[PDB]
């Protein structure tokens, strides 16, 4: 396939692997949230690898992300990354999500596809930041 497509799929796969690694340090609610995020990232990878031939995520996934972002923003009032080990894992996941966002943005500029995927990745990075801060507070 195309070099940007392969790079974006590889980076999204790496993000999924890191999220799967980090989901073993959180509680049940956050573990379920991270598993749903992993399923969404698989859907995004499918639609990116198919070059848009296969439909990707729907808008209600981004709506769900934004609802979680608001719910965790009302619980969060400058710190170094990794106040605890669990929050450090999510900080690493957030940085890798931003890297995947950069790759998907390159794909979007090249081929005109994946704008919703890029929006999902941006909201996911915001949610990961919020979750790390929530664990630090708790």
């Amino acid at each position: 396939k195309d070099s940007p497509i392969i790079e974006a799929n590889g980076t999204l796969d790496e993000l999924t692997s890191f999220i799967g690694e980090a989901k073993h340090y959180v509680d049940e609610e956050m573990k379920g949230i991270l598993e749903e995020i992993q399923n969404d990232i698989y859907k995004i990878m499918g639609e990116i690898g198919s070059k848009g031939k296969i439909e990707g995520i729907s808008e209600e996934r981004i709506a769900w992300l934004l609802k979680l972002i608001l719910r965790y923003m009302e619980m969060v009032n400058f710190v170094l990354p990794g106040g605890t080990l669990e929050s450090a894992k999510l900080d690493v996941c957030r940085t890798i999500a931003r890297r995947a966002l950069r790759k998907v943005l390159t794909v979007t500029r090249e081929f005109g596809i994946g704008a919703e995927a890029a929006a999902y990745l941006l909201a996911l990075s915001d949610l990961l930041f919020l979750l790390a801060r929530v664990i630090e507070i708790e």
Binding site: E59, I62, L70, L122, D126
Partner: protein, 118 residues
């Protein structure tokens, strides 16, 4: 940024336009791309309106978000999706069929943009 929300007169909202604009402003501020006091929202009701050519009672809700240029398509798409979700949640009904809700995100030229505080 500037937000203009246009609703037909037959459209029924769950909350009044004031609460709708509050929710929209909170959603915009939650993105982190704007200052708190720079978000300016406004609601307009349309009295003369037609949707399509069929003789069916219809309602629609349209919002246009104007932001300064320099933000990526990911940010623009996320802002549009957030606004559309808020607006769809705010719609109670209207017309004889489903209500179409649409959001535009358009970029204003930052280089020629004039702004003053009195």
């Amino acid at each position: 940024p500037h937000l203009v929300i246009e609703a037909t007169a037959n459209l029924r909202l769950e909350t009044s336009p004031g609460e709708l604009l509050e929710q929209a402003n909170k959603a915009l501020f939650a993105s982190g791309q704007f200052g708190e006091a720079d978000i300016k929202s406004r609601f307009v009701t349309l009295e003369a309106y037609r949707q399509g050519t069929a003789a069916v009672e219809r309602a629609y809700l349209h919002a246009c978000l104007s932001i300064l240029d320099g933000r990526d398509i990911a940010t623009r798409t996320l802002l549009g999706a957030s606004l559309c979700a808020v607006l769809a949640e705010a719609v109670a009904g209207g017309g004889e069929e489903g209500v179409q809700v649409s959001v535009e995100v358009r970029e204003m030229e930052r280089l020629s943009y004039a702004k003053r505080v009195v």
